[PDB]
Design a protein around this ligand. Structure first.
Ligand SMILES: [Zn+2]
Ligand SMILES: [Zn+2]
Lengths: 114, 222, 46, 673, 57, 108
């Protein structure tokens, strides 16, 4: 799923097929450095696009003076009783009125939806 | 022994060198190296969790700088020289890089003001004049014209033409070196009138366009 | 899988071309040009 | 314009070395004198602004310069000489300026010259008439904007208009496109869209990997670290993969320069000229605001990478597109940045015709004289023409110029005069039916009057600015850069592109100038310096967006500001001690300036106004309760300062229907008084 | 603005008063934030009439 | 250890003259070049530009044993001078000015 760079000329390693041992070989097209593939899959295309933005929001958003705050929902990892919540603010806005939270305690940065 | 030959001795000796970044004002102080070249004292204190290096100015040079060690990772460097005898030498490889910084001796604002003191003049401001300066003078003969007049009085073209055959000595002279010469090149030799010179050129020769206009005369091939 | 009768231009780029071609030129159902069709029952006498 | 912007133009001009011997000429210093009128018999006398109106004169001041001339013939002596205070031309003078005859006079003397003590000033007198310059709007420069043209071949587009610090007549613009997905073809259906670029001074489109290699960086591990800043992202790397496939066969520098060098304003017949031609166009016309020197070409690579890294984020749907009418992307051209633009094109035109007079006069080898070379009617009649008639161009250029500037002052009633010296103008057409450049935008709060606008065909095209709105004048970014480097900011060159994922890119005036690893302490250190005015002047804006993880700083001219009240934890910073000593300005010498320099008010730009939380009134919004917010950062002075000049004479304007307030503001301009 | 209508509200506020609901009467007067939204509505209503005449003629 | 206890003090001098100009010859640390493999080297200004500005051409271990091209940095003393500090037998330190910065890279 990732990418492979040549170890000699630092370029993009293409996948190739050899008719001897039935194993995927990654080859270069400037030099001919070789090696075998460990996962033996090339292409993947996610159409659902249901990526949870809990992996994209940053912990320093709790320094924003223009975001609402809450005393109801406390943090689990530290027990702080003050959070700051917001919406998806991105694409995939068909049914996007969820409410992600971020703890505001210094050096906690814990994030969670509900 | 060759100009393009590089000495590898330093490298092959694994000679090490140190690299230190220094501010210009300090470097300007350093161009005034106390006396011959003395300049101060470096002090090095290494403790369990803190290695402190600093340099102190020569008392003469004066009339604490902590060091910040920098990584030479990503780019390992070496020092190479050019003698006053233009000989080339590699002294060593850089084993340390560092930066001299201020510490508890100056605030950021006035330190910026000290840089302001270093270049404190205002770039070409538009000043305010009083009244109006004189613009038109009363010269009689323009200076440029007088220089041209003096050059003209030196030489007068109205020369005489006796023993006219001698030119032909000079003209043919030139014509042997190159088959043809632009009328202007021939004039640069004969100061006599072009019309009369053309009669001398027409008498002993013919003019060819040679192909790019440029009136050019040549000796008759007969 | 591709029909193996072709193996006795690379087949990988061909398979990616086919993959990128079938998901837009599928033509499962309906008429090609009409995109969205709604539904309601009116209350007016119109 | 007349203290700095005119001295820099003549000082930063190429000498005219010309030729055997050869000569030198260079200009050093500029002077001016008070406006003066030359009588019929050649006796000068200062003209007062009143005679200029009565006798249909023009209010202008003469202009001088110092020129030095050295002859270089290696004739065993370098003969230099100078002619100081040489006459050049005459510049109009705006009334009540620092260069007028009415500067700093008292009412007993203003009445003695038959002048009104209430006259505001700020207009020119040209052939008896009274002309006023209208501020023109303009799209902001040196920033990246991402749009989406839904009609043409492109699926996304970027733009960056660059100009190297007020020194270029044109402004080079560069696009970074991306072709459409639904390209009907059995070939590119599989690979996908290819990122393209449309450089200036070339005919054909160019793939981006090619123009990357023309700067060096031929390897594809080094290119793909200027464009992608973290290699744990497979979704983005998949999108840049089909950009390499078409630039794969051309894999070295010199053949790349030939590829772009083959299609220019002149197709190169030979090879070395194309490799020469492609060298400067990619060096002096590509992104001139970053650096124009032939060195420091690693910066032109990073910025071109950031321009492309930002184009992909707009395709994955991770950041929203830019807004065209968002009033934080606009700049205003006052009389300063307008007359300076018109003075360049007439100083070059004055040097272009000292050569034509020197060559004709030095081939005969006689000598040289410069007082006869300067055609003085170039600058005098050049400015006076375009101001008097309006078309912002040249006399033989009455077809290529922008019209509508410099109209006649309105003197029907005293509030129709003030409402004329404060007026903007958006340069879009006057009949286009597109509504989005005409509707009222949210960002006009407090900086443009919402009610005052004319009807007819010019609805929403001309606008008047609010009462306390203040336009900035500009400054040099030199003293902030010297502070930033000594506050632990890593330069771009001496850093590894893997230490860039968790750092906040620091921009200054449009140019990427480093990174930083602890921004929140940098920010509230930059601010507390501006609050008390040590290193940074009060008109710079400093934006920080937490999410996109960067920091911007601006110092240029054209941004529009307005003062606000600074708020600490939940209380104002304006204590009573400031009031009982502010009601005494008459014999205390304590005024507005001593109020800014004490850190209780602050000018807030439009861009900076998106990272702020305002309260509308102290006694009512800053009380602890079950409250709306609790982190208020600023507070308004009085919410009645959001109205213009002609709309703030209406009693109880918050009780009328809205179109009614628009009619009166366009109707109190024609009331007799 | 970005996720706001004016710098006096908190982000993503969907209430009635934060997106244009004027709850006063012309006799009791409007508050500043309502004055501004009223001006916006009036402006669009004023542009349409300017277009209509030329089109129909 | 000493690197953790070796307190010391040494004198620093900055001589107003030198018998040779001092430059920096940077190298890629990722390449991890074994300088021991450099039996010899040749070093000449690059010929593409057909002097002090010329990029260097380094030929190690023969004409094609190893070859690098060195490109001059934009600036070296634009704000702060760079110094070479060397240890002398008397323990005192000697400082040498950096004249230029050249960037060296490997060549297929
Ligand atoms: Zn390879
Ligand atoms: Zn927590």
């Amino acid at each position: 799923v990732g990418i492979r760079f040549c170890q000699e000329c630092n370029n993009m390693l293409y996948p190739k097929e050899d008719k001897e041992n039935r194993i995927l070989l990654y080859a270069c097209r400037n030099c001919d450095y070789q090696q075998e593939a460990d996962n033996s899959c090339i292409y993947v295309n996610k159409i659902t696009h249901e990526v949870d933005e809990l992996t994209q929001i940053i912990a320093d958003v709790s320094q924003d003076p223009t975001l609402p705050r809450t005393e109801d929902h406390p943090c689990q990892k530290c027990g702080h009783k003050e959070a700051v919540f917001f919406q998806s603010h991105s694409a995939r806005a068909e049914d996007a009125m969820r409410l992600y939270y971020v703890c505001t305690a210094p050096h906690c940065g814990h994030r969670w939806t509900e | 022994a060759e100009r393009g030959e590089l000495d590898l001795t330093g490298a092959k000796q694994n000679t090490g060198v140190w690299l230190v970044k220094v501010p210009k004002y300090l470097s300007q102080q350093w161009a005034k190296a106390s006396g011959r070249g003395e300049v101060g004292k470096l002090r090095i204190a290494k403790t369990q969790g803190r290695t402190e290096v600093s340099f102190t100015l020569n008392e003469d040079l004066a009339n604490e700088h902590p060091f910040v060690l920098q990584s030479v990772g990503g780019q390992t460097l070496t020092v190479f020289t050019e003698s006053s005898s233009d000989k080339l030498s590699l002294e060593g490889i850089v084993v340390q890089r560092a930066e001299c910084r201020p510490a508890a001796s100056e605030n950021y604002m006035r330190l910026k003001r000290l840089q302001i003191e270093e270049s404190s003049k205002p770039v070409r401001l538009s000043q305010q004049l009083d009244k109006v300066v004189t613009t038109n003078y009363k010269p009689v003969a323009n200076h440029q014209y007088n220089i041209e007049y003096e050059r003209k009085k030196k030489e007068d073209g109205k020369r005489a033409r006796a023993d006219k055959q001698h030119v032909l000595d000079m003209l043919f002279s030139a014509f042997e070196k190159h088959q043809y010469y632009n009328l202007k090149d021939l004039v640069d030799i004969t100061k006599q009138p072009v019309v009369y010179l053309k009669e001398i050129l027409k008498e002993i020769g013919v003019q060819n366009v040679k192909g790019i206009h440029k009136n050019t005369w040549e000796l008759k091939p007969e | 899988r591709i029909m193996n009768s072709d193996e006795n231009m690379d087949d990988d780029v061909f398979l990616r071309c086919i993959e990128s071609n079938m998901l837009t030129d599928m033509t499962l159902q309906g008429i090609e040009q009409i995109s969205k069709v709604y539904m309601h029952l009116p209350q007016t006498d119109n | 314009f007349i203290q700095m912007s005119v001295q820099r133009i003549v000082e930063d001009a190429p000498p005219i070395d010309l030729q055997p011997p050869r000569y030198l000429l260079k200009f050093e210093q500029i002077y001016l004198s008070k406006p003066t009128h030359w009588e019929r018999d050649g006796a000068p006398s200062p003209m007062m602004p009143n005679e200029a109106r009565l006798r249909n004169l023009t209010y202008s001041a003469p202009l001088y310069v110092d020129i030095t001339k050295t002859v270089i013939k290696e004739g065993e002596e370098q003969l230099q000489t100078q002619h100081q205070k040489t006459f050049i031309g005459k510049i109009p003078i705006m009334l009540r300026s620092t260069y007028c005859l009415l500067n700093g006079l008292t009412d007993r003397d203003l009445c003695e010259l038959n002048e009104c003590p209430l006259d505001p000033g700020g207009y020119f007198i040209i052939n008896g008439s009274e002309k006023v310059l209208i501020a023109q709007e303009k799209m902001a420069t040196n920033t990246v904007y991402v749009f989406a043209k839904k009609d043409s071949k492109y699926a996304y587009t970027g733009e960056c208009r660059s100009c190297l610090e007020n020194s270029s007549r044109p402004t080079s613009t560069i696009w970074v496109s991306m072709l459409a997905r639904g390209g009907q073809g059995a070939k590119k259906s599989a690979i996908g869209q290819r990122i393209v670029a449309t450089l200036p001074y070339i005919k054909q489109e160019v793939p981006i990997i090619i123009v990357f290699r023309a700067l060096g960086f031929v390897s594809d591990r080094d290119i793909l670290e200027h464009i992608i800043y973290d290699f744990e992202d497979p979704e983005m790397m998949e999108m840049v993969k089909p950009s390499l496939d078409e630039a794969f066969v051309i894999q070295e520098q010199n053949v790349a320069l030939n590829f772009i060098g083959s299609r220019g304003a002149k197709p190169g017949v030979t090879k070395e000229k194309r490799i020469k031609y492609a060298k400067e166009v990619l060096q002096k016309e590509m992104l001139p605001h970053v650096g124009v020197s032939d060195f420091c070409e690693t910066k032109k690579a990073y910025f071109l990478g950031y321009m492309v890294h930002r184009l992909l984020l707009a395709a994955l749907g991770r950041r929203e597109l830019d807004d065209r009418d968002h009033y934080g992307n606009k700049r205003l051209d006052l009389a300063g940045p307008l007359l300076a633009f018109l003075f360049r094109g007439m100083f070059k035109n004055l040097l272009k015709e000292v050569r034509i007079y020197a060559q004709k006069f030095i081939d005969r080898g006689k000598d040289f004289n410069l007082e006869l070379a300067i055609k003085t009617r170039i600058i005098s009649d050049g400015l006076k023409y375009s101001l008097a008639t309006g078309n912002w161009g040249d006399q033989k250029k009455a077809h290529q110029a922008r019209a509508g500037v410099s109209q006649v002052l309105n003197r029907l009633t005293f509030a129709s005069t003030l409402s004329h010296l404060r007026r903007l103008n958006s340069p879009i057409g006057r009949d286009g039916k597109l509504a989005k450049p005409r509707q009222l935008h949210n960002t006009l709060w407090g900086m443009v009057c919402p009610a005052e606008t004319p009807e007819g065909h010019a609805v929403g095209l001309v606008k008047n600015l609010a009462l306390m709105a203040y336009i900035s004048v500009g400054s040099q970014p030199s003293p902030i850069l010297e502070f930033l480097e000594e506050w632990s900011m890593e330069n771009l060159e001496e850093i590894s592109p893997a230490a860039i994922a968790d750092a906040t890119k620091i921009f200054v005036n449009g140019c990427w100038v480093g990174i930083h690893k602890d921004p929140e302490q940098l920010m509230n250190t930059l601010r507390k310096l501006r609050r008390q005015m040590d290193i940074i002047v009060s008109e710079v804006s400093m934006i920080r967006d937490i999410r996109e993880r960067e920091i911007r700083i601006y110092t240029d001219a054209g941004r529009i500001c307005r003062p606000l009240l600074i708020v600490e934890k939940q209380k104002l910073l304006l204590k009573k001690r400031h009031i009982d000593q502010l009601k005494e300005r008459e014999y205390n010498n304590y005024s507005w300036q001593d109020l800014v320099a004490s850190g209780v008010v602050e000018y807030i730009d439009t861009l900076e106004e998106e990272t702020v939380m305002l309260a509308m009134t102290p006694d009512d919004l800053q009380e602890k309760e079950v409250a709306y917010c609790s982190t208020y950062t600023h507070c308004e002075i009085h919410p009645s300062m959001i109205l213009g000049v002609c709309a703030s004479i209406i009693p109880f304007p918050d009780h009328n229907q809205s179109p009614r307030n628009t009619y009166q503001s366009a109707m109190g301009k024609q009331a007799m008084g | 603005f970005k996720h706001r209508t004016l710098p006096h509200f908190i982000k993503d506020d969907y209430g009635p008063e934060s997106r244009g609901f004027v709850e006063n009467s012309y006799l009791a007067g409007l508050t500043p934030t309502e004055f501004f939204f009223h001006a916006m509505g009036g402006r669009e209503g004023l542009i349409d009439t300017a277009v209509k005449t030329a089109e129909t003629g | 250890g000493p690197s953790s206890q070796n307190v010391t003090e040494y004198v620093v001098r900055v001589p107003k003259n030198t018998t040779k100009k001092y430059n920096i010859m940077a190298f890629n640390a990722a390449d991890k070049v074994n300088f021991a493999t450099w039996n010899q080297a040749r070093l000449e200004r690059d010929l593409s530009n057909k002097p002090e500005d010329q990029p260097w051409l380094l030929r190690v271990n023969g004409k094609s044993g190893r070859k690098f091209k060195g490109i001059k940095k934009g600036g070296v003393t634009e704000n702060t001078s760079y110094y070479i500090f060397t240890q002398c037998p008397d323990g005192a330190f000697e400082a040498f000015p950096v004249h230029n910065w050249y960037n060296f890279t490997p060549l297929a």
